[PDB]
Amino acid sequence: MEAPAAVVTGAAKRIGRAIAVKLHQTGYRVVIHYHNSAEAAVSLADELNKERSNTAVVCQADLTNSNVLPASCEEIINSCFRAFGRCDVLVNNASAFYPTPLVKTVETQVAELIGTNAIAPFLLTMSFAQRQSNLSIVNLCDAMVDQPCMAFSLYNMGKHALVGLTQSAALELAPYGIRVNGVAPGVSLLPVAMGEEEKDKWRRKVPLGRREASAEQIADAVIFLVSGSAQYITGSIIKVDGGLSLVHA
Amino acid sequence: EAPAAVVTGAAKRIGRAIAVKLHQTGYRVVIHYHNSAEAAVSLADELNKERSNTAVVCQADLTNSNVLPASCEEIINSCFRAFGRCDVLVNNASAFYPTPLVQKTVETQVAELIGTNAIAPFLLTMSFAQRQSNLSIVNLCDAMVDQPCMAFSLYNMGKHALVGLTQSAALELAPYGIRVNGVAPGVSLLPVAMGEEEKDKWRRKVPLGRREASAEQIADAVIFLVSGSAQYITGSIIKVDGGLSLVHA
Amino acid sequence: EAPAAVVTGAAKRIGRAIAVKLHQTGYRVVIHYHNSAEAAVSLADELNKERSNTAVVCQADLTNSNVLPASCEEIINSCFRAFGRCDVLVNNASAFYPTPLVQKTVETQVAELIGTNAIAPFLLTMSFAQRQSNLSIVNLCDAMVDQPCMAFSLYNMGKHALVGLTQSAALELAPYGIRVNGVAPGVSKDKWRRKVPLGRREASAEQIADAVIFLVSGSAQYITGSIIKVDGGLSLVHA
Amino acid sequence: EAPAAVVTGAAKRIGRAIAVKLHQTGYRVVIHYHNSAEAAVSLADELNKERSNTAVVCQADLTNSNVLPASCEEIINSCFRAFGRCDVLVNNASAFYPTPLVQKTVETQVAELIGTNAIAPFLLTMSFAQRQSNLSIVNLCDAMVDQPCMAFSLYNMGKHALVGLTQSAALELAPYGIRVNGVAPGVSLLPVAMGEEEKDKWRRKVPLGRREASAEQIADAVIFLVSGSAQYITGSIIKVDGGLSLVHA
Ligand SMILES: NC(=O)c1ccc[n+]([C@@H]2O[C@H](COP(=O)([O-])OP(=O)(O)OC[C@H]3O[C@@H](n4cnc5c(N)ncnc54)[C@H](OP(=O)(O)O)[C@@H]3O)[C@@H](O)[C@H]2O)c1
Ligand SMILES: NC(=O)c1ccc[n+]([C@@H]2O[C@H](COP(=O)([O-])OP(=O)(O)OC[C@H]3O[C@@H](n4cnc5c(N)ncnc54)[C@H](OP(=O)(O)O)[C@@H]3O)[C@@H](O)[C@H]2O)c1
Ligand SMILES: NC(=O)c1ccc[n+]([C@@H]2O[C@H](COP(=O)([O-])OP(=O)(O)OC[C@H]3O[C@@H](n4cnc5c(N)ncnc54)[C@H](OP(=O)(O)O)[C@@H]3O)[C@@H](O)[C@H]2O)c1
Ligand SMILES: NC(=O)c1ccc[n+]([C@@H]2O[C@H](COP(=O)([O-])OP(=O)(O)OC[C@H]3O[C@@H](n4cnc5c(N)ncnc54)[C@H](OP(=O)(O)O)[C@@H]3O)[C@@H](O)[C@H]2O)c1
Ligand SMILES: Nc1nc(N)c2c(n1)[nH]c1ccc(O)cc12
Ligand SMILES: Nc1nc(N)c2c(n1)[nH]c1ccc(O)cc12
Ligand SMILES: Nc1nc(N)c2c(n1)[nH]c1ccc(O)cc12
Ligand SMILES: Nc1nc(N)c2c(n1)[nH]c1ccc(O)cc12
């Protein structure tokens, strides 16, 4: 009852998994939210519960925008209170990412890219605050939102909307002692299936070490922002990009 | 011979001033409106009295829905039907009201605030580009996006998403010769519902003249960005705020 | 009658295009120069042939030193002595060269880069404001200030300082009806041209000058503390 | 062997807090000071009583002059003379006073405000890099540089120049494995000269707790940036402002 509890969206794999593991290692009980990756979510929960019993549960939800998304987001937050009796930390990590050229239906693309990257964060933030000591929300942003990838307008719109949520929610929730911050990766984990020749093109752009961030390096910034060492920090977005965003064309 | 412009939410206030000033510059205009049919028709009558066959109205709800892409395609189609071309799109229409995080359905609020401020601009941008010189798009942004109104999360999210669209569409549409820029008012025409005491509180905050922007002052920056004097400007957002965004708390 | 403008570094390139376009708009102009006397006088001769006694030149070193305040007071005073008024100040003069962090003295580089790009604009702003119907200052900024050229630390510091001055001066001078804004060129090598999204159009000094003309016009009377990027979209392009 | 840090302006207030927290983390420290000799020596004595031979003082004026490069080289050299290495540089020393545009010589004000806030950090960064594992530089910026205090032009110019240095130095020193970041306080320790009524005016503006940052809160963000938990972070500026910069006029 004395261990704090965290919800991490899109926690089965990659960066969300690293966040969930590092929160667990810091002493949090975790809700591992997932959409399609059930086997991976359950494997992570079983690993964490082997390390300390009754410290991890999974929660499935589609975070695409729809008439039912508010209820789904309320139920993710409720899953943390039902398992652990509290919810101290929300990490909005789940995200759709694919091109939408201006030149799936376009409204499905809107629902997926704006829903996962912005509306679901907003509704999870409402539900988190309504249900409420070091409370905080961390949003996974994008260091490159001002130099965006060609043909990613909806993704980019969603990530800019998430900056606006981070700022608006930081201002409105400060009186409740809820801090709201972001972590903005540059290039972190690349797709397994991406050719090494294409991965290397991206790695060579990064000033600091000519490599992508590990998931753990992203998670380290999340751990800092939820810690007692960040008690005066709200409305801040920490770039974890190895200097990538400083590199001109 | 005369270029043509679409102005969304053009029946009243800033959109009306933009439509008038484009018309005075030589443009044929589509006056888009949602509810303000009498004002839209009155404006078209006034512009047509000055030069015949230079203004038409087009009704559309720009709330997000599965038919919003068709409504946006229809607005651009209405410009081609009336005038045989579409040179300028001004994304001005916008919903604005509070959406507190702590306590219309929330999904209707998402649809209205994110639809009008961000998704409709995106879909109008797609339709504008697909249907294609001095081609340009001007998005009406908000100079106060980083110092937002308490309890305006969804509005602020939509205006941040509009910044993202302005940048992403500038990058992607540059090869087609379409420039995409923004105009960011601070306090301009104050809400019709606001009491006089509250209006004077906001006026006194503005360094340059202790007054709100006129609609015509906002329209002047739109006129610059669509002109031949801006043909190397794309992805830029011009604040028209009298210095308000420079004022600390 | 006619308003008057000071343009620093006005003998060549962007300053010259700004001076010509202000003159064409109906301003009388002070053409400031440091080393380019022949070019400054050639420009003044071209403008005075169009309208008599509407252009003068003014020599000043804008390197920071013990005398830079007096030099900046003289540039503003030159406008008031020639024309009886000073409505517009365009801070265009700039030094540009690399200053690597790892291996002219470095303090000479500070005096040139920080002096010309930031301190002279500050002192000219003070002198302009102290001597005071559509009054404004336009600072020539840099669209790539947040994605800087490798080994250009002092240049980049000076251009960031000039953003700070634009904002601080906009705030402090708004009560005097003086607007303060910036224009931020991108590129004004074929390598650089190929990266520009609007690169089908040639970058020109006239395009920068067009943004300056907008900002000093009545069409910008509510605009202060704004920096207009004129970069063809270059600052949007990722590495 | 213990790493070593230089902290400028470290005799009192935030610089002392940074020196203390670096010492508690296991660094040997150079306590730079200008006028505060008694406070600097009293701090070095306290740190040396905790662990012998872990703190020294170094006096220097960081006003700009033709000698400033030699002074900055000497500060870095004092860390190597004492400790055999120099792992961290914290640029904290800063002059802060108004310089009204409309009415010390102005050139003295330039030398002090631009010297301490920008040129000395630049020259110390050059000396730090030239003299060269987890190497990093942390610059103390200002969260309110875009909403500045009235009549502080030179101070604001100096802090904007420091942001430029942070980004330029991050790009250029990344290949040498030197990270360069910033910490941007909003309101922390209020000026000693300020009356309680004026201090309370500022405190009431801060969303998160209606109070200024403690010196330790600022030092916490510095400790994070120099730590292994920030190995991929360079060119980032962490606001530590309690949401103050999000508050509109
Ligand atoms: N990787 C990078 O280089 C990078 C760069 C910049 C920003 N970021 C940001 O960092 C965060 C993590 O990145 P990442 O690469 O680890 O993410 P990712 O692998 O692309 O996606 C994370 C998870 O999001 C969940 N998700 C996707 N669509 C969803 C939906 N409709 N409903 C619910 N959940 C859904 C998925 O869960 P299931 O697998 O369970 O279906 C997926 O595993 C994201 O916010 C991303 O934008 C990453
Ligand atoms: N006024 C300011 O101080 C200020 C400040 C910052 C930014 N801005 C921006 O500048 C632009 C103009 O501002 P304004 O105050 O003139 O705007 P406004 O009066 O609030 O709204 C403009 C028009 O938007 C239309 N609109 C609202 N909901 C809509 C929907 N669901 N579908 C279609 N149209 C809809 C309305 O058309 P009908 O009347 O026909 O229904 C309305 O007349 C907006 O983008 C605004 O965000 C304004
Ligand atoms: N060119 C670009 O692509 C570009 C890009 C970004 C920003 N900008 C900005 O746009 C503005 C104009 O650019 P530009 O390329 O036309 O500038 P420029 O040719 O490099 O220099 C303009 C003038 O500055 C004056 N100047 C230089 N050092 C001086 C000193 N110590 N004292 C007095 N005057 C001095 C010179 O006048 P004299 O010849 O009389 O000695 C010079 O002709 C600058 O502020 C620049 O930073 C330009
Ligand atoms: N306090 C805040 O609320 C706040 C807000 C925003 C940003 N910051 C930034 O955070 C840092 C620490 O702030 P603070 O309030 O603790 O600073 P501070 O007390 O105003 O100044 C720190 C030290 O700077 C040194 N300094 C001043 N002029 C100098 C010179 N000419 N040569 C060498 N050193 C000089 C002084 O050393 P001596 O005492 O030995 O003479 C002084 O103790 C500063 O960079 C500041 O700009 C602070
Ligand atoms: N959800 C999600 N997944 C990703 N793989 C990226 C992403 N968001 N943003 C990215 C930006 C750059 C990149 O290389 C990858 C990503
Ligand atoms: N559609 C729309 N209408 C408004 N009246 C404002 C708006 N957007 N943004 C505003 C920001 C400030 C303000 O005083 C008013 C507004
Ligand atoms: N005074 C001055 N002169 C220049 N040529 C540039 C400059 N400032 N900034 C530049 C940025 C890019 C570039 O290609 C050129 C410049
Ligand atoms: N060197 C220095 N000392 C200070 N006391 C402040 C400062 N810089 N910046 C500040 C910004 C706000 C404030 O209340 C105080 C300060």
Locate the ligand 1 atom nearest the alpha carbon of residue A16 and give its number: 16
D74 phi and psi, to 5 degrees?
Answer: -65, -35
Q: Provide, as residue numbers in chain C, all residues whose Cβ is less than 8 Å from the Cβ of B224.
A: 214, 219
CB contact under 8 A, B229 and C213: yes
Q: Which residues contact B247 (CB under 8 A, 6 or more apart)?
A: B205, B207, C171, D147, D248, D249
CA torsion C211→C213→C215→C217, rounded to 10°? -150
- What SS3 class is residue A30? strand
Helix (H) or strand (E) holding D125: helix D120-131
Q: Provide, as residue numbers in chain D, all residues whose Cβ is less than 8 Å from the Cβ of A247.
A: 171
CB contact under 8 A, B249 and D149: no
Q: How far is residue D245 CA from its own chain's centroid?
A: 20
Inter-chain Cβ pairs, chain B and chain C, closer than 8 A:
103
Residue B2 token pair: 């005369």
Q: How far is the CA of A115 from the centre of ligand 1 (A)?
A: 12
Residue B177 token pair: 């010769």
Kind of pairing between the strands at B237-240 and C178-185? unpaired
The candidate with the shortest Cα–Cα distance to A100, out of D5, B126, B223, is B126
CB contact under 8 A, B147 and D246: yes
Angle at B138 between CA B133 and CA B140, to 5 degrees: 170
Whole-Å CA distances, B76 to B8, D24, D111, D149? 11, 65, 58, 47
What is the C-alpha separation between C37 and C43, in angstroms, rounded? Answer: 10
Task: Determine if ligand 7 sits within 6 Å of the CB of residue C92.
Answer: no
The candidate with the shortest Cα–Cα distance to A24, out of A60, A56, A46, A59, is A56
A64 phi and psi, to 5 degrees?
Answer: -60, 140
The candidate with the shortest Cα–Cα distance to B30, out of B68, B79, B86, is B79
* Chain D, nearest residue to A212 by Cα: D232
Could you tell me which residues of chain A have a Cβ less than 8 Å from any Cβ in chain D?
167, 170-171, 174-175, 177, 179, 207-209, 213-214, 217, 220-221, 223-224, 229-236, 238-243, 245-247
- What SS3 class is residue A222? helix
- Name residue A136's amino acid: S
Q: How far is the CA of A142 from the centre of ligand 1 (A)?
A: 12
What is the C-alpha separation between A39 and B78, in angstroms, rounded? Answer: 51
Question: Would you list the DSSP string of B64-131?
Answer: -STTHHHHHHHHHHHHHHHHS---EEEE---------S----HHHHHHHHHIIIIIHHHHHHHHHHHH
Q: Provide, as residue numbers in chain C, all residues whose Cβ is less than 8 Å from the Cβ of A146.
A: 235-236
CB contact under 8 A, A152 and B171: no
What is the C-alpha separation between C41 and C20, in angstroms, rounded? Answer: 13
CB contact under 8 A, A246 and C195: no
Residue C89 token pair: 């100040």
Q: Which of C215, C216, C222 to mutate to test the interface with B (most CBs of B within 10 A)?
A: C222
Q: How far is the CA of C52 from the centre of ligand 5 (A)?
A: 62
**Do B184 and B238 meet the contact criterion of CB atoms below 8 Å apart?**
yes
Distance from CA of B123 to the nearest CA of A (A): 8
The candidate with the shortest Cα–Cα distance to A247, out of D118, C185, D235, C142, is D235
* DSSP assigned state of C225: S
What is the C-alpha separation between B21 and B19, in angstroms, rounded? Answer: 6
Could you tell me which residues of chain B have a Cβ less than 8 Å from any Cβ in chain D?
144, 146-149, 205, 244-249
The candidate with the shortest Cα–Cα distance to C129, out of B245, D100, D98, is D100
Angle between helices B120-131 and B68-83 (to 10 degrees): 40
The candidate with the shortest Cα–Cα distance to C94, out of C58, C137, C139, is C139
**Do B59 and B34 meet the contact criterion of CB atoms below 8 Å apart?**
yes
Q: Considering CB atoms only, which of C197, C201, C224 is closest to B171? A: C197
What is the C-alpha separation between A42 and A47, in angstroms, rounded? Answer: 9
- What SS3 class is residue B162? helix
D146 counts as catalytic: no
What is the C-alpha separation between C128 and D152, in angstroms, rounded? Answer: 18
Place of tokens 């000076």: C158
Active-site residue identified among B27, B142, B176, B220: B142
Residue D187 token pair: 């309101």
Whole-Å CA distances, A166 to A143, C190, D96? 14, 41, 31
The count of domains in chain A is 1
Kind of pairing between the strands at B4-7 and B28-33? parallel
The candidate with the shortest Cα–Cα distance to B89, out of B8, B152, B192, is B8
* Chain C, nearest residue to D148 by Cα: C168
The CATH number that applies at residue B216 is 3.40.50.720
Whole-Å CA distances, B112 to A119, B95, C4, C9, D24? 13, 6, 49, 51, 53
Q: How far is residue D185 CA from its own chain's centroid?
A: 11
Length of chain D equals 249
Q: Considering CB atoms only, which of C66, C107, C151 is closest to D107? A: C66
Residue B143 token pair: 């100079």
Q: Which residues contact D99 (CB under 8 A, 6 or more apart)?
A: D106, D109, D113, D151, D152, D153, D154, D155
Instruction: Identify the domain containing residue B14 by its residue range.
Output: 4-246
D142 counts as catalytic: yes
Q: How far is the CA of D96 from the centre of ligand 8 (A)?
A: 6
Q: After which residues is chain D broken (C to N over 2.5 A)?
A: 103, 132
Q: After which residues is chain A broken (C to N over 2.5 A)?
A: 103, 132
**Do B159 and B117 meet the contact criterion of CB atoms below 8 Å apart?**
yes
The candidate with the shortest Cα–Cα distance to D90, out of D168, D6, D31, D181, is D6
Helix %, strand %, coil % of chain D (to 5) = 50, 15, 35
Q: What is the largest CA-CA distance in chain D?
A: 55
Q: Which strands make up the sheet holding B135-140, listed edge to edge?
A: B55-59, B28-33, B4-7, B88-91, B135-140, B178-185, B237-240
Helix %, strand %, coil % of chain B (to 5) = 50, 15, 35
Pocket test for ligand 1, best of A8, A15, A58, A138 (most atoms within 8 A of CB): A15
**Do C117 and C95 meet the contact criterion of CB atoms below 8 Å apart?**
yes
Residue B191: other Cβ atoms inside 10 A: 11
Given in angstroms, what resolution was this structure solved at?
A: 1.3
Helix (H) or strand (E) holding C227: strand C227-230
Q: How far is the CA of C163 from the centre of ligand 4 (A)?
A: 23
Pocket test for ligand 4, best of D94, D119, D141, D244 (most atoms within 8 A of CB): D94
Q: Which strands make up the sheet holding A56-60, listed edge to edge?
A: A56-60, A29-34, A5-8, A89-92, A135-140, A178-185, A237-240
Kind of pairing between the strands at D28-33 and A178-185? unpaired
- Conformational region of residue B64, where left means phi above 0, alpha means psi within -120 to 50, and beta covers everything else: beta
The candidate with the shortest Cα–Cα distance to C63, out of C23, C12, C119, is C119
Place of tokens 């300056």: C212
Q: How far is the CA of D26 from the centre of ligand 1 (A)?
A: 38
Task: Determine if ligand 1 sits within 6 Å of the CB of residue A93.
Answer: yes
Question: Would you list the DSSP string of B17-63?
Answer: HHHHHHHHHT-EEEEEESS-HHHHHHHHHHHHHHSTT-EEEEE---S
Solving technique? X-ray
Q: Provide, as residue numbers in chain B, all residues whose Cβ is less than 8 Å from the Cβ of C205.
A: none
What is the C-alpha separation between B100 and B91, in angstroms, rounded? Answer: 26
Q: How far is residue C72 CA from its own chain's centroid?
A: 14
Residue D78: other Cβ atoms inside 10 A: 19
Work out the burial of residue A228: count CB atoms within 10 Å of its CB; fewer than 13 is exposed, 13-18 middle, 19 or more buried: exposed
Locate the ligand 5 atom nearest the alpha carbon of residue A187 and give its number: 14
Could you tell me which residues of chain C have a Cβ less than 8 Å from any Cβ in chain A?
144, 146-149, 195, 234-239
Q: Provide, as residue numbers in chain A, all residues whose Cβ is less than 8 Å from the Cβ of B100.
A: 172
Question: Which residue owns the Cα nearest ligand 6 atom 3?
Answer: B96
Q: Which residues contact C146 (CB under 8 A, 6 or more apart)?
A: A246, C235, D167
- B/e letters for D98-122, b = 16+ CB within 10 Å, e = fewer, are ebebeeeebbebbbbbbbbbbbbbb
- Name residue D95's amino acid: A
Work out the burial of residue C13: count CB atoms within 10 Å of its CB; fewer than 13 is exposed, 13-18 middle, 19 or more buried: middle
* DSSP assigned state of D115: I
Active-site residue identified among D155, D200, D220, D241: D155
Place of tokens 């002198």: C127
Distance from CA of B162 to the nearest CA of A (A): 7
Length of chain A equals 249
D58 phi and psi, to 5 degrees?
Answer: -145, 115
Question: Would you list the DSSP string of D139-183?
Answer: EE--TTTTSPPTT-HHHHHHHHHHHHHHHHHHHHHGGGTEEEEEE
Q: Provide, as residue numbers in chain C, all residues whose Cβ is less than 8 Å from the Cβ of A247.
A: 147, 238-239
- What SS3 class is residue B182? strand
Distance from CA of D10 to the nearest CA of A (A): 21
User: Could you tell me the sign of the dihedral formed by the alpha carbons of C146, C151, C153, C155, in that order?
Assistant: negative
Kind of pairing between the strands at B88-91 and B4-7? parallel
CB contact under 8 A, C222 and B241: yes
Q: How far is the CA of D6 from the centre of ligand 7 (A)?
A: 35
Work out the burial of residue B107: count CB atoms within 10 Å of its CB; fewer than 13 is exposed, 13-18 middle, 19 or more buried: middle
Q: Considering CB atoms only, which of C200, C222, C225 is closest to B177? A: C200
- What SS3 class is residue A102? coil
Distance from CA of A206 to the nearest CA of D (A): 9
Q: Which residues contact A130 (CB under 8 A, 6 or more apart)?
A: B101, B102, B103
- DSSP E strands in C83-177: the ranges are 88-91, 135-140
Question: Which residue owns the Cα nearest ligand 5 atom 6?
Answer: A97
Helix %, strand %, coil % of chain A (to 5) = 50, 15, 35
- DSSP E strands in A178-247: the ranges are 178-185, 237-240
Q: What is the largest CA-CA distance in chain C?
A: 55
Q: How far is residue B17 CA from its own chain's centroid?
A: 11
What is the C-alpha separation between B18 and B21, in angstroms, rounded? Answer: 5
Q: Is C36 annotated as a binding-site member? A: yes
Helix (H) or strand (E) holding C204: none
* Chain A, nearest residue to B162 by Cα: A157
Distance from CA of C201 to the nearest CA of A (A): 18
Q: Which residues contact C3 (CB under 8 A, 6 or more apart)?
A: C26, C27, C28, C85, C87, C88, C133, C134
Distance from CA of B177 to the nearest CA of D (A): 33
- Name residue B39's amino acid: A
What is the C-alpha separation between C60 and D90, in angstroms, rounded? Answer: 38
